[PDB]
Design a protein around this nucleic acid. Structure first.
Ligand SMILES: [Mg+2]
Ligand SMILES: [Zn+2]
Ligand SMILES: [Zn+2]
Ligand SMILES: [Zn+2]
Lengths: 112, 178, 552, 271, 171, 87, 107, 97
DNA sequence: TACTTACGCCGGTCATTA
DNA sequence: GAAAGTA
RNA sequence: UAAAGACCAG
């Protein structure tokens, strides 16, 4: 029910203004604030304090303590996050990168 | 470099590479338990000379064959001749290694017939010794059980002197003449 | 990038394994000892003393030297060095943890304060979550202030079971600047400052299984490591100097703070080897901790900003990464880039929706590396001859042999016989897809791909209906343009972010571009029943429509 | 924050919407798997109106002289009157349409009948019509089965998820529930004949598009919906030129996103 | 000793070679890069086996440039030497410091001091020799050696061997 | 593991090629033709790689395979051929 | 299920996790005056057999951490007396699709 | 000009994966350091020339790779090191999943 | 129960400096 | 300067 | 070349 209100509410701030937002955007927000169990906030206190990798997290609010608390509890960032790859300068797993591209040698002869 | 079928996760502490000796302690990349191309345990493949003379020869030949399907659209002193040709027709030519190995192999092979070389194998194989030994025993001409157990220390308590003495006898026979 | 071939296999990074540096590693990895606090002058002679910055570390001078490595300035990354502190010191960042870890383990013996024997503890010890677990284990152990010898087993509370033992009451520790002070109690308290050596040692004795329980790691980060012993010296590339000609200084901020740490260090040691008026040596030790603490974080609670003679606070390393304008957020999440251009915009009712008029001046600067293919050898050769100053032209030829011919000087510019596989950096030409954008960029739409149309005059010309999306007027707004440099990059621009593609937006399931100003106010009138058009005109109005089937 | 908070969320190759941990944030993107840019505000007729009017529209009684498809509308008019087997399907239909009407009034308690859904079915038909030059004068040549069975069959093709197992399959039926009510709403035997004089050809066409069009509307695995939503909410917060008195606008959203405790206006409504 | 080891290389092909007979170009590259190679990890790579079935697998198209990256799995015949491996070969070089015996692709060196003493060096002879109460060792002479130690060097492996123990020496 | 390569049938993704897969195939393919890679169509006039690329895709003569990752690491392969190119 | 009127002693409520397997719940009368599950906003939940659950995870290739979580002390979680691990299936009406499947695992 | 944070978020929105990597790398930083296959450090004393590689301290010369990361990051790393923190970079994964 | 801590929207020119 | 999370 | 500051554009 919480999630129900949290949305009704966000929806009404954009409603008063007289603008429109397709339900999905507000929803995806509202659901994120909700999955973990309660009311994680879009705050240095809530969201950025999860399991997402060090490098990601450190690119918002507490940059250095996050990197320290990291080498100290020897975390491991697997790099599934956009930010991880941006920092590393590699193609992130986004749209054009959500998949790989293979040369099929077989079909490369069917054609000739 | 060329990655081999074993992925030991080297987490920082990279230090423990033991002494490589015929205590049968060979590299990690040479244990009894190997892992096959298709991911299945396969026991170490050790070759005694001559047997490796055939292996190489065979492939070097089979290769020359396919090399022409695409071009569509005996006697010691004599083989060092016949082989030196096959090489210059299926090898990089600069492979001084393969050339040398082929000569060495040809000049020191103890069995020249894929049949004889199979006998040797069957014979030895019943011992249960480790591939390294079964290979050495095969490529080192030994008379007394002592000469053997001395050049192949790994043995010593693995097979009786008489037993190993029998096998050594059987080998001197199969020992293709020249 | 990096340049010059390397036989080394090239892979991508898949995992970042964070951890702390063990003093024994630093020594290993180091390539220079570093004893002297000076920088150079082998007795005023300009070079570099085997003391600080390059006693074999990186380099300076566009002087290939660098312990064989050579390569020179660009290519040689840094080479770390070390500096054997004279006494163990904290690490500003971990003072909080060191404190809390002590409160969790008893001193003198070095063992947890709540075995599996205690219940509530067990609960915590089960908590899989390095961080939340240590979090709990503490709340339980901070309170426990005696290294019990025997605890009533999980049976009868009368017979007490044996565990480790050493009653030694545990001192309630507290923080004073960069020191941890504890007050024991037995029978008034007994106040004494816990030494680094002291705490470092307790830790060195904390059981491997006990780190772990307390969110640590046997291989990558044991508590004892939060106490610096051997200090890693970052190489020139990290703290480059500034050479104004020959006879002039230039040392970086960090290079000074190391010299300080090095000085304050030499000081101490030479005291423990001489008249050691003990409780006066400790006067000099606190100093070392001040710098080694300050060199990292220099915005601590106990104020003393550690100012550089000139009032300036001295950029702590931490300072360098703190968000916005700072490394992570200013140099990686976003950065200044090449192949970009910006200038005043102005509407033009004669450009198709998806084009963008580009001033020739700008088209002659931004280029695109096209590769000599039989498909274009001819064209490209034409552009090259054409030179870098005429428009339809180019300004750089690059042969396989990594080396670029500067078409505006190479004594052979008029010459040059291209070669398949070669690369010609040519001028932006009509239709090169480009990224056009106006800030603040809060829309996918604030950045869209356009077709280039080189035109005269100095303004970016853009179609009106595309106005809103960017949210631009022509009262002086400027807009920036980015030219994709690779064949697939453009493909990504043209196939995914072209203006036409962005017309109907998810933002609110409706089009985000319509007809405006003149055309709008005017389309109404044209429409009104009253409004009739007579032949002479109608004929023009018809001709203007570029598609018209030519059927009055 | 909205952005940094959702960066890593995108629709994966399985239609699930996960973050950079593989944690599910929505099982199917937007509760329907449809891409926002492919949706228009259509109206679910069934919802409103009097039970009376609803009947006069969707009801077809082949067993009643006064309530059958007049033989003018259909070509198999007279020979269908009184067919007990056809009136079995023709019922099944009306009993579903009514089911829907209930279900919609359940979902949209309000009665509000205009909601954005993929495939603009009205236009698809508008074209059908003056594409084939259909004259509201002649009789169609649709079997009562043609209509009923086609529509029933079409739905089998509006695929959002493609698992070959029961869990997924249920998921599939769910994600399509509302679209279908819309579909049956507009492809009811009475309508397809009395309203839009669709001919067998036209019908076979409309059906074909609705399908393609639908399929095109499904979201593409890749779509970084995270940032998209962040910006879609964030952007209009910038355009906010700021019982009635209650915190509102920017200051209010700031309240919400922060999940702040004490709020300026903490009212509560009792019915 | 001599083994048959299952290995694997990784070749990056330019897009130019995205021909109809690509597999053939890959296989040939493999051969250039492996046959004759030498590591300490695997030893001397000598002959790639079973040519006709060298597994090619699908290549990954590298993102920035258009090359494809292939992980070629082959199987070859290698020769890694060890301490205590008794092996016999032919002498090649011979000086006042000892003689160099050639075993396979490799070379084992015998130190005058790892030979029995009775066996002394003879400079005044040609080709230079080492003689004993009954033996005589020179360039051509076959010898059975005992490898005391190896030293992996760039593109090769060397070792030092003795013939002072029993059953070693000339044959 | 490759215990992760979901067998051909049992594949459950989309029959259709996503916008990115196509944007990315056309780009990659251009990038290769642009590099003197062998072309698989009659470049009837054509001289621009993206143009050529589009043509190849049109006659489904692009020898590439899209490897689609599922959040767990398992993956399904699809041929630029199989893939329905509505888009 | 023990329904107390005003409250129990921390002494008493400290003898609950004492008779395993059997479990014990405790509700305050005031908390039950109104059934919350009858609320406009509260969607119907559903416990899943450890089979129904193991399936769910198979058909979405999930681990447990990748599932939306419900709190042990969650009002409805109590109503159904959930347990750490038990998965609930929430079914709510959608303005986008009519019905929406949603799972929540327990904390 | 600055392709800043917000501009980055847009390319992400578009799903223009490559173009993003292009701005950040080819069109700005992009450096080529050599990593050690054991410790994820940037220690490799590579002398691309005499083909020698080495990593005394880990004692290597064999397990070594090269990578392409934005120089600004090469800095970030050497800096986390100066602060005694180790950002080990690894070419393959372990944790699986 | 009172004390401690992170943070802040997204290009251009001129002046001065231990 | 305001608001939220520890000794 | 690098800081810190003032002023100013949309
Ligand atoms: Mg303006
Ligand atoms: Zn160097
Ligand atoms: Zn103790
Ligand atoms: Zn190393």
């Amino acid at each position: 029910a919480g999630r129900a209100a949290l949305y009704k509410e966000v929806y009404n701030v954009i409603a008063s203004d007289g603008s429109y937002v397709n339900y999905r955007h507000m929803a995806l927000l509202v659901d994120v604030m909700t999955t973990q169990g309660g009311l994680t906030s879009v705050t240095r206190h809530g969201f950025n304090r999860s399991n997402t990798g060090a490098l990601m997290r450190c690119s918002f609010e507490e940059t250095v303590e996050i990197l320290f608390e990291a080498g100290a509890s020897a975390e491991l960032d697997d790099c599934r996050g956009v930010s991880e790859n941006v920092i590393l300068g590699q193609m992130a797993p986004i749209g054009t990168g959500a998949f790989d591209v293979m040369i099929d040698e077989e079909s490369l002869v069917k054609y000739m | 470099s060329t990655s081999t079928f074993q992925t030991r996760r080297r987490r920082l502490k990279k230090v423990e590479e033991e002494e490589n000796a015929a205590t049968l302690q060979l590299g990690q990349e040479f244990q009894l338990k190997q892992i096959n191309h298709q991911g299945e345990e396969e026991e170490l493949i050790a070759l005694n000379l001559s047997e490796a003379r055939l292996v190489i020869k065979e492939a070097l030949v089979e290769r020359r064959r396919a090399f022409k399907r695409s071009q569509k659209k005996e006697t010691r002193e004599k083989e060092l001749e016949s082989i030196d040709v096959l090489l210059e027709q299926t090898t990089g030519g600069n492979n001084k290694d393969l050339k040398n190995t082929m000569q060495y192999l040809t000049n020191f092979s103890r069995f020249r017939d894929q049949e004889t070389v199979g006998a040797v194998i069957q014979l030895l194989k019943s011992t249960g010794l480790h591939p390294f030994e079964v290979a050495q025993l095969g490529s080192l001409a030994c008379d007394t059980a002592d000469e053997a157990k001395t050049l192949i220390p790994s043995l010593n308590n693995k097979i009786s002197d008489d037993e190993l003495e029998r096998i050594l006898k059987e080998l001197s026979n199969l020992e293709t003449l020249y | 990038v990096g340049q010059q071939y390397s036989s080394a296999p090239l892979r991508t990074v898949k995992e970042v394994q964070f951890g702390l540096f063990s003093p024994e590693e630093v020594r290993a990895i180091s390539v220079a000892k570093i004893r002297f606090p000076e920088t150079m002058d082998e007795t005023q002679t300009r070079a570099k003393i085997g003391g600080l910055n390059d006693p074999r570390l990186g380099s300076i001078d566009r002087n290939l030297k660098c312990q064989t490595c050579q390569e020179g300035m660009n290519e040689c990354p840094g080479h770390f060095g070390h500096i054997d502190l004279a006494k163990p010191v904290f690490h500003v960042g971990f003072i909080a943890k060191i404190k809390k870890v002590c409160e969790c383990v008893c001193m003198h013996c070095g063992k947890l304060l709540l075995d599996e024997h205690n219940e509530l503890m067990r609960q915590a010890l089960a908590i899989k979550d390095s961080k939340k677990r240590f979090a709990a284990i503490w709340t339980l152990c901070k309170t426990k202030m005696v290294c019990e010898t025997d605890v009533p087993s999980e049976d009868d509370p009368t017979q007490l079971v044996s565990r480790g033992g050493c009653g030694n009451t545990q001192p309630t520790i507290r923080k004073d600047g960069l020191k941890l002070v504890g007050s024991w109690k037995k029978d008034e308290p007994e106040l004494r400052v816990l030494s680094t050596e002291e705490i470092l040692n307790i830790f060195k004795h904390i059981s491997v299984k006990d780190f772990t329980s307390l969110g640590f790691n046997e291989v990558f980060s044991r508590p004892e490591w939060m106490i610096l012993t051997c200090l890693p010296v970052p190489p020139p590339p990290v703290r480059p100097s500034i050479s104004f000609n020959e006879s002039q200084r230039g040392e970086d901020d960090l290079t000074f703070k190391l010299a300080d740490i090095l000085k304050a260090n030499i000081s101490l040691e030479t005291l423990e080897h001489n008249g050691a008026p003990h409780h006066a040596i400790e006067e000099a030790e606190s100093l070392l901790q001040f710098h080694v603490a300050t060199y990292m974080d220099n915005d601590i609670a106990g104020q003393p900003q550690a100012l550089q003679k000139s009032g300036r606070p001295v950029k702590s390393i931490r300072a360098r990464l703190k968000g916005k304008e700072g490394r992570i957020r200013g140099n990686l999440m976003g950065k200044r880039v090449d192949f970009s251009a910006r200038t005043v915009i102005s509407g033009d009712p004669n450009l198709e929706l998806d084009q963008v008029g580009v001033p020739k001046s700008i088209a002659k600067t931004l280029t695109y590396p096209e590769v000599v293919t039989p498909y274009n050898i001819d064209r490209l050769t034409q552009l090259v001859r054409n030179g870098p100053n005429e428009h339809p032209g180019a300004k750089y030829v690059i042969r396989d042999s990594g080396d670029r011919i500067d078409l505006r000087y190479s004594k052979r510019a008029g010459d040059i016989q291209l070669q398949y596989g070669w690369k010609v950096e040519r001028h932006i030409m009509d239709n090169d897809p480009v990224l056009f954008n106006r800030q603040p960029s809060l829309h996918k739409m604030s950045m869209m791909a356009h077709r280039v149309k080189v035109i005269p005059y100095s303004t970016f010309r853009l179609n009106l209906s595309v106005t809103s999306p960017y949210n631009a007027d022509f009262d002086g707004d400027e807009m920036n343009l980015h030219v994709p440099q690779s064949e697939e990059t453009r493909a990504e621009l043209s196939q995914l972010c072209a203006v036409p593609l962005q017309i109907v937006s998810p933002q609110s399931n409706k089009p985000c571009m319509g007809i405006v100003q003149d055309t709008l106010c005017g389309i109404r009138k044209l429409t009104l029943r009253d409004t009739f058009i007579e032949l002479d005109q109608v004929l023009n109005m018809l001709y203007w429509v570029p598609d018209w089937d030519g059927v009055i | 924050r909205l952005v940094k908070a959702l960066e890593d969320i995108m629709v994966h190759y399985d239609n699930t919407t996960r973050n950079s941990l593989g944690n599910v944030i929505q099982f199917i993107y937007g509760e329907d798997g449809m891409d926002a840019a492919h949706i228009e505000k259509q109206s679910l007729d069934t919802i409103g109106g009097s039970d009376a009017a609803f009947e006069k529209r969707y009801r077809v009684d082949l067993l009643n002289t006064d309530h059958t498809l007049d033989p003018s509308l259909l070509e198999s008019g007279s020979e269908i009157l009184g067919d007990l087997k056809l009136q079995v399907l023709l019922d099944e239909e009306y009993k579903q349409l009514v089911k829907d009407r209930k279900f919609l009034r359940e979902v949209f308690v309000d009665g509000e009948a205009n909601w954005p859904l993929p495939v603009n079915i009205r236009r698809i038909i508008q074209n059908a019509q003056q594409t084939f030059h259909i004259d509201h004068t002649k009789p169609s040549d649709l079997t009562i089965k043609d209509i009923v069975l086609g529509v029933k069959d079409l739905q089998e093709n509006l695929l959002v998820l493609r698992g070959k197992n029961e869990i997924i399959q249920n998921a599939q039926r769910d994600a399509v529930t509302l679209f279908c009510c819309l579909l049956r709403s507009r492809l009811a035997t009475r309508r397809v004949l009395q309203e839009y004089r669709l001919t067998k050809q036209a019908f076979d066409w409309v059906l074909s598009n609705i399908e393609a069009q639908f399929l095109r509307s499904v979201v593409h695995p890749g779509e970084m919906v995270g940032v998209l939503a962040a910006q879609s909410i964030g952007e209009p917060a910038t355009q906010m030129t700021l019982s009635k008195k209650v915190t509102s606008g920017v200051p209010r959203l700031k309240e919400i996103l922060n999940v702040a405790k004490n709020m300026k206006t903490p009212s509560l409504t009792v019915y | 000793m001599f083994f048959i080891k299952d290995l694997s290389l990784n070749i990056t092909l330019h897009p130019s070679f995205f021909g109809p007979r690509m597999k053939q170009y890959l296989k040939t590259k493999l051969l250039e890069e492996v046959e004759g190679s030498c590591t300490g990890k695997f030893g001397y790579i000598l002959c790639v086996l079973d040519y006709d079935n060298i597994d090619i697998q699908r290549g990954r198209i590298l993102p920035t440039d258009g090359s494809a990256e292939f992980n070629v799995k082959y199987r070859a015949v290698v020769f890694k030497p060890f301490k205590g491996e008794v092996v016999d070969g032919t002498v090649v070089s011979c000086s006042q410091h000892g003689f160099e015996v050639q075993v396979g692709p490799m070379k084992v060196f015998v130190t005058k001091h790892l030979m029995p003493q009775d066996l002394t060096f003879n400079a005044g002879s040609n080709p230079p020799s080492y003689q004993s109460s009954e033996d005589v060792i020179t360039i051509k002479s076959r010898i059975r050696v005992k490898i005391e130690g190896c030293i992996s060097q760039v593109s090769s492996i060397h070792a030092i061997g003795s013939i002072k123990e029993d059953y070693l020496g000339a044959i | 593991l490759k215990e992760k390569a979901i067998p051909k049938d049992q594949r459950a993704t989309t029959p259709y090629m996503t916008k990115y897969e196509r944007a990315r195939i056309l780009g990659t393919r251009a990038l290769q033709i642009s590099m003197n890679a062998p072309v698989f169509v009659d470049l009837e006039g054509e001289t621009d790689p993206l143009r050529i690329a589009m043509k190849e895709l049109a006659e489904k003569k692009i020898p590439l395979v899209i490897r689609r990752y599922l959040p767990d690491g398992s993956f399904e392969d699809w041929s630029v051929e199989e893939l329905i190119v509505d888009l | 299920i023990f329904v107390y009127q005003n409250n129990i002693t921390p002494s008493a409520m400290k003898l609950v996790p004492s008779i395993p397997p059997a479990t014990i719940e405790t509700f305050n009368e005031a908390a039950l005056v109104v059934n919350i599950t009858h609320h406009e906003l509260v969607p119907k939940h559903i416990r899943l057999s450890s089979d129904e659950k193991r399936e769910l995870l198979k058909r979405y290739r999930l681990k447990e951490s990748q599932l939306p979580r419900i709190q042990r002390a969650d009002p409805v979680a109590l109503y159904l007396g959930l347990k750490r691990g038990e998965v609930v299936k929430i079914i709510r009406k959608s303005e986008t699709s009519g019905r929406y499947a949603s799972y929540r695992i327990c904390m | 000009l600055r392709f800043g944070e917000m501009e980055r978020d847009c390319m992400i929105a578009h799903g223009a994966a490559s173009f993003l990597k292009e701005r950040l790398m080819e069109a700005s930083d992009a450096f080529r350091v050599h990593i050690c296959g054991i410790c994820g450090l940037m220690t490799v004393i590579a002398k691309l020339n005499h083909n020698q590689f080495e990593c005394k301290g880990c004692d290597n010369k064999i397990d070594i790779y090269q990578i392409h990361i934005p120089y600004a990051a090469k800095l970030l790393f050497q800096e986390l090191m100066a602060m005694n923190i180790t950002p080990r970079l690894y070419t393959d994964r372990s944790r699986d999943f």
